[PDB]
Every structure is written in structure tokens, then in C-alpha cells.
Design a protein around this nucleic acid. Structure first.
Lengths: 56, 54, 139, 75, 115
RNA sequence: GAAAUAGCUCGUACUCCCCGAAAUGCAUUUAGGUGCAGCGUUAGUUAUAAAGUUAUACAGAGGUAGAGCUACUGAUUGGAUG
RNA sequence: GUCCAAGUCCGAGAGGGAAAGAACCCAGACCAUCAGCUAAGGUCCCCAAAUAUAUGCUAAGUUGAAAGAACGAGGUUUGUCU
RNA sequence: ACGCUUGGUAACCGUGCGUAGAGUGCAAUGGCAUAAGGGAGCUUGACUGAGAGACAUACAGGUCGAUCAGGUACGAAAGUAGAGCAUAGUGAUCCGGUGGUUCCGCAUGGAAGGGCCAUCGCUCAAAGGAUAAAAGGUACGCCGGGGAUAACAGGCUGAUCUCC
RNA sequence: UAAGGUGGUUAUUGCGGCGGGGCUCACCUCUUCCCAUCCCGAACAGAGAAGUUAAGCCCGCUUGCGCAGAUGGUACUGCAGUUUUGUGGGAGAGUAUGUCGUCGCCUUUC
């Protein structure tokens, strides 16, 4: 179980990377969501890792 | 030179059967003269018959 | 001037030269040469090629050869003056060769180092490229 | 100039791929010349178009001097 | 392809391009040669051969090659109409349908083996 | 007649709440206008619901970047034969 | 400048920074408050915050905004071979 | 490539090497030798009634196509044939002409005429064709709009120019 | 064990060279008949068994021509910032090297 929180803004990001955030439970810069560690979510984190921060 | 020919059935129009069978084909007025005749299926008589160019 | 005797097409599109030519950067049949150390591709024209060749041939009068490892194979066009933009491509103006960073252009085999450095330095002043003097490893 | 003419594209390319299902009359490949040859349960048309014959799964399986032989595994 | 074998392989290729056979309705290949003509029933979809006949057994009477081929055809027909095979696709194996091949085919047609 | 017609310019009056585009494609006596498609709003439908979006695993067809030409077509530097 | 393709923004978008700029960097404004934490960018004064710490370079006011050539030189610091 | 009178290595012939450099009517691309290239025999499926299912898709349109029935051509039979190796060779509607048709036919019976199927007439070439039928001047001009668009000047860039 | 027939496997399976073999395969002898040459029994077809491994065919060897081909490195490229780069993917060519096939079913044989 890892915690991921959006640190940057999706205003100048492409549509793919902007939908990659909505795929997770992220809709605002002040949010933080907890997910599992399956290999499916660590492709979304790799897609948008410059916009989020994964603590644990 | 390529003309449009109309091959009408020949054995038709001799029996008491209304209708007329025709086939609209193309030909050449120089390479194949003299009223081409071809055996085609007559849909009225239900048998193959010789159709001659009109 | 160096240009093809004939070719399939007269007009050729002006492509994009991405540098660091990975072929033609080694010396062969000659021990001294000049190589391009520029940062982007260049168009070496037949006038520049002939000028550099004759400048390097006037030096070292009859000693050694001058290998030219390049050829102006592509045609560059230019529409006439006082013409508005766009009625088709213009007539072929001249012929040029693509030179990418790392390509060797001239080579000398006969003369020693003292003369081959001066001749190549005299020839490199006619080319629009920053050139460095390279010597072969087996020397 | 004298160069301003062209024709409309024919929308060629590869239809249903070698891992998807087809049915009795689904166009598989549109070509200009038989570069994808028909295999099992796949036939070719007048315009060198590959048609399916039965419902199944497509399979290309290039072989025999680099020649595609599109076939269908029934299911 | 003119060595009397490549010429036959070409015919066999352009015949097998359309002649085949499953477990039901198999293929009937023939091999001529200078003497002792052979015939065989092959299943091309699964490998295994069903049956095979030849003019080398205690059933063929000596004579002309045409009569020998007719007898071999009758024998292979009577042998194939035992298990239940009723239809066949007769190919040629690169031989013209005339002479011993036609005699074998007619000897098989006089019996059963609908084809 | 007559408030002729204007594919043209100008003007178009109170408040609050919710949603929210386009400047593309095909035609046109057509290009600063329209017709249809594309994008919007309102309402109603799929339920043991269906479809969408992103990522992962698996499986496909391609001929771009690159590369090469003694692998064709065209071009091409230098030596040996002639 | 012009004609296409893959994205973003302005168009229809307030706020902060580059001194002032529709697009550049950060960032998507329901109101009210003399509350707090940060992004880009900064902490000598105009003008909020370091005349903060550690190491080296520059002597040209180069520089403190953006942006420069072929070609010269016994400016200086530093690594290897010699 | 090697031999041979004309005959000349570019005519025909003989023997080898030759995966395709030939040819496929006509441009280019793709394909084709187990031929789609060439020859011989027999023939007319260049048939009738039709279209499971797909590809393109604003619409109008366009392309491919498997089973069934009735009679055929070739083949011993399987089997193939609903035009050409495949993509260009084209023109909507209205109107008029020809062949077939107790389909209708204005009180009744005919007829004129119309309807249905097959088919003909348009460089309507400005080829989605505004009419069957169509060229110029205006410095005597007028009205409605445009910096959507030029001439002078300003702006960006130097092809040209000038200087180093 | 050997041979013949017939299939699967993208030439690592092919081409060439050197030696061996023949119950089946092949040349080999003839054209009255079935059949055919835009001329020829050359090919196809038929009738036979005097001879033969000479050739076709099958075995064993050959890196010779072909075909296949790494590891490493490089080019190129998706995402993020930028003069620099970091993260992943990763060629082509070339070198070492490999290859004189392999897998089934029937008939006669040991």
C-alpha cells in the first residue's frame, strides 16, 4: 500500500498524461490517495511521475 | 468502332409464348462484322438458344 | 566543376541534416586530412570544392595527390529576383554536398607532414566549415 | 506549373489482425496484388482481397521465403 | 525442369494445389515406373496412410500392363471397400490420364469407391 | 406600387443560478453565404447492465528514423589489368 | 511569412514572475476574513524575505535581461602525456 | 559464352550458364515461374432469380463477396466458369425514342396516353451538371462593405545594395 | 539394415567437388496396336527384358560457393529539463562462429 499525492498541476500536460491522473483518485493538487503495489499502478506512476510524489 | 449490339432470341417469337429474350452486349464494327450469333440462355423458354444480332 | 553527368530527377527536396556522420570519418589511402568539427550540417558547393582543390594543388606543386572524399550530388535551386512567393520550385542554381560533423573532405598521401599541414591549412580557408587537421594512427 | 494532380486514396491496409475473431464473410486484407496469400479457410477475390470462409481466429504465420499465408483456425 | 523427374514434380505440384483428402474421401496416388505399378490411399490432413496396392502379391496374373493396372485397380477398390471408405479423390501423380492410369481408374470405377 | 431587395454595415433594454463550443471535412455560379458531417445543451434509454479512459501481460500487420548497396535502379573517389 | 501533421495555451481565462508583452515559467478565480504552508522566481536599497555558510574562478564593470562569426593573442585556473 | 553459308555476336539453329534483369495492349505501384507470362483442343458463365457478411463512408454514390434454385461449357472425375493480374477509360435529374407487358386506362368496349423491365440521346470538359437558349466598356459612373486585400509611409528578413 | 512411394519443417535443408551401391528405381530395345510431334517414339503413350551402375537416384566426406549468425559497443528513439543530461527500448553493418539437415505414415527386405 503506497500513498501518492499530486504535487504539480495538469494545465500544460497532454491529454494522455491528464487522463492518467483521473485514472487514479487524483482530481486536485491538494489530494492524496492510497493504492496497492500491483504492476498495473506502477505504469501509471511511471507515466505521470513528474506530477505526483509517492511516499509509501 | 465499338458498337452496342442487341442479340435477340431466334427460336423465340415463333411459339405462342408472350415475351422476347434479349442480351445487350458490345462489339466492334470492324473486327467482328456480320451479325454475331451466340448461344445464350433464354429465361422465357428455360433453355439455351442461339441469339443473333439485330 | 564536379557535378553528375546526369540524374533521374532535376529538383530535390531540402531535407534535414542531423549531425555526427557515422560513416566517412576515418582516413584511408592517405595519412593527413582535414575533418569538419562544426556543430551542424553544411552544404559544400562545387565552387568552394574547386577553389580549395586548386589552392591545395598550387602548394606542393607536383608532390603527392589530393584525395577528395566528397561529391556535390544534390541540386540546390533559387528562384529569380523580384518574384512573389510561390509559383513552383525554381530552376536549379548549383550543386552541393552534405557535410556533417566528423566527415573528412581532403586527404594528402605523398608530401611529408611539414608540407601537408601547410597545404591543408591553405585549402581550409576556402570552406565554410571549422576544420581540424587529423593524422592517421598508423603513422 | 504542371504538377497539381492526384487521385483519392483507396483506404488499403490490413483489416482484422492475427489475434482477433472473424466471421463467414469478413474482409481480412485489402491489397493491390497477392502479397498476403490465402491459407486454410481463407480465399482470395478478384481484387486480391482476402476473405474469410468460416468463423474463427486469424493467423498470419509468415513462411516459405517470407510470404504471408493468412489462415483461420475455426472455433 | 526437363529431366523427366522435374517435369513430373511440376505436374504433381499443380495437381496437389487442388487435390487433397481428409479421413473421409482420401487421396489416391499412383506411381507408374517401368514395371510393377503401385497405388496408395493417403490422408493429407492427418498423415497416416490408409491402404496401398501393388502388382507384387499372390493375386495378380501376368500379362499386359493395361490388364495388370486394371487388376490392381480392382484389388485396391475391393480392399478399400472393407472399412467403409466409399468416396475418393483420384489424382494422377504427374501422369497423363491415358493407358495404365486410366485402366486403374476404370477398374476402380467398375467396383465401388464412388468417384 | 412600397415597409422594392440588400448573402452588406450598424444597433438589439431587468436580475440570479447551472452547463458550455468552433474557426475542421465534403459539395456549391462556391470561397466574408449556405447544405450535411464533426464539436454543445435539455430530456429519455442499456441493469444479473453496457460502454468509455489510463496502465500492465500476451498476440499481431507495417517499411518511418537509422543503416547499406559486390542486393536491384540512378549517381560516384582512387589504383590494377586494356 | 506560408501550407500540413502530433500536443498545449489564447481565443472564451482571472492571479504570481521575467520592469512594462493575448501565447513564455508557475497556476484553473463561489463569496467574506488585519490567518497559515508552498509553486515559478528571489532574500543590499527602490520593493517581502540572507550584506547567510563552504569551496574555486573573473579584473573585463565581463556580468548582474536575451543574443553573436570566420580569424588573432606570452590573460588566467586546472588534468594527462611529454 | 562457345560453334555455323549468306549473317555482320544484334535475324534462325545446336550446347551450357541463367529465380525473373522478360512479359503481363496503353502511365506508375503492387503481384505473378507449383504463373496472373506463352501454346493447342473444345466452347460462350461476357447466364436467369439474387446477395450470408464486410471495407469505405455528410448525402448521392462506390468496392469485395459466401450459400440456394433452373439450365449450360470444359473435364474421366474432383472441380472451375455470374468477363479480362488489380487499381483510370467517366455525367445525377428532367424530357424524348425503341423492344416486351389485358398493370391502369376518367359512363361502358376499344384507343390516345401513362405505369413496370431492358435500353438509347448531353467534351452538361466550369465534369454534384443554377436556362432549351448569352459577349464587352465606363477616366461620366453610382450604391453597399473591406485594412478579410494592393499603391505612399511604418513594422519583421536581407534575396538585392553598401561597408569591413 | 537398405530401398521405393507420399507429407510436415522460412536453404543451418540449396549448388559444386570427391569415392561406394543396386530383389523394388533408372537408363536400355522396338513402334503392330492406345496415344503425339506447328519436323522428329526427342518428349508423351504402348509393347519387352540382351545389357548396365555409365548417368538419374541413394549413401560417406569436403568450408569450397551459398545460407544462418552472436556477446559487447554504436546510431536512433518514448518521457522529464535543458548548453550540459537522467531514465527505458535498442538497431543496421562488421567480427568470432554454425551448417553438407530434421520429423512422420505405408510396401518389399535384415
Amino acid at each position: 500500500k503506497l500513498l501518492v499525492k499530486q504535487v504539480r498541476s495538469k494545465i500544460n500536460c497532454p491529454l494522455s498524461q491528464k487522463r492518467g491522473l483521473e485514472a487514479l483518485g487524483l482530481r486536485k493538487l491538494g489530494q492524496v490517495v492510497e493504492h496497492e503495489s500491483n504492476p498495473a499502478i506502477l505504469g501509471m506512476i511511471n507515466k505521470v511521475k513528474h506530477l505526483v510524489s509517492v511516499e509509501e | 468502332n465499338r458498337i452496342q449490339v442487341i442479340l435477340e432470341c431466334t427460336e423465340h417469337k415463333t411459339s405462342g409464348v408472350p415475351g422476347t429474350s434479349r442480351y445487350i452486349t458490345t462489339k466492334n464494327k470492324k473486327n467482328t462484322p456480320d451479325r454475331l450469333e451466340i448461344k445464350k440462355f433464354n429465361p422465357i423458354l428455360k433453355r439455351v438458344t442461339v441469339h443473333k444480332e439485330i | 566543376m564536379l557535378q553528375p553527368k546526369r540524374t533521374k530527377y532535376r529538383k530535390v527536396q531540402k531535407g534535414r541534416m542531423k549531425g555526427n556522420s557515422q560513416r566517412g570519418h576515418e582516413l584511408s589511402n592517405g595519412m593527413f586530412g582535414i575533418k569538419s568539427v562544426h556543430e551542424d550540417g553544411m552544404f559544400l558547393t562545387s565552387r568552394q570544392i574547386e577553389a580549395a582543390r586548386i589552392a591545395a594543388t598550387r602548394y606542393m606543386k607536383r608532390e603527392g595527390q589530393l584525395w577528395i572524399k566528397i561529391f556535390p550530388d544534390k541540386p540546390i535551386t533559387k528562384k529569380p529576383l523580384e518574384v512573389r512567393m510561390g509559383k513552383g520550385k525554381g530552376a536549379v542554381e548549383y550543386w552541393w554536398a552534405v557535410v556533417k560533423p566528423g566527415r573528412i573532405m581532403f586527404e594528402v598521401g605523398g608530401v611529408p607532414l611539414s608540407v601537408a599541414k601547410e597545404a591543408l591549412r591553405l585549402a581550409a580557408q576556402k570552406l565554410p566549415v571549422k576544420t581540424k587537421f587529423v593524422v592517421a594512427r598508423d603513422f | 506549373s504542371k504538377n497539381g494532380r492526384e487521385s483519392e486514396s483507396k483506404r488499403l491496409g490490413v483489416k482484422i489482425y492475427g489475434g482477433q475473431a472473424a466471421i463467414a464473410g469478413n474482409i481480412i486484407v485489402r491489397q493491390r496484388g497477392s502479397k498476403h496469400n490465402p491459407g486454410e479457410n481463407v480465399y482470395i477475390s478478384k481484387d486480391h482481397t482476402l476473405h474469410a470462409r468460416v468463423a474463427g481466429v486469424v493467423k498470419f504465420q509468415k513462411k516459405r521465403d517470407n510470404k504471408s499465408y493468412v489462415s483461420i483456425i475455426p472455433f | 525442369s526437363l529431366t523427366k523427374s522435374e517435369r513430373r514434380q511440376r505436374i504433381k505440384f499443380r495437381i496437389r494445389k487442388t487435390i487433397s483428402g481428409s479421413a473421409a474421401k482420401p487421396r489416391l496416388s499412383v506411381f507408374r515406373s517401368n514395371k510393377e505399378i503401385y497405388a496408395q490411399l493417403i490422408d493429407d490432413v492427418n498423415g497416416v496412410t490408409i491402404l496401398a496396392a501393388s502388382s507384387r502379391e499372390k493375386e495378380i496374373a501376368k500379362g499386359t500392363n493395361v490388364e495388370i493396372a486394371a487388376a490392381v485397380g480392382k484389388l485396391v477398390a475391393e480392399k478399400a471397400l472393407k472399412a467403409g471408405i466409399d468416396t475418393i479423390t483420384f489424382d494422377r501423380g504427374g501422369y497423363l490420364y491415358h493407358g495404365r492410369i486410366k485402366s486403374l481408374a476404370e477398374g476402380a470405377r467398375a467396383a465401388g469407391l464412388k468417384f
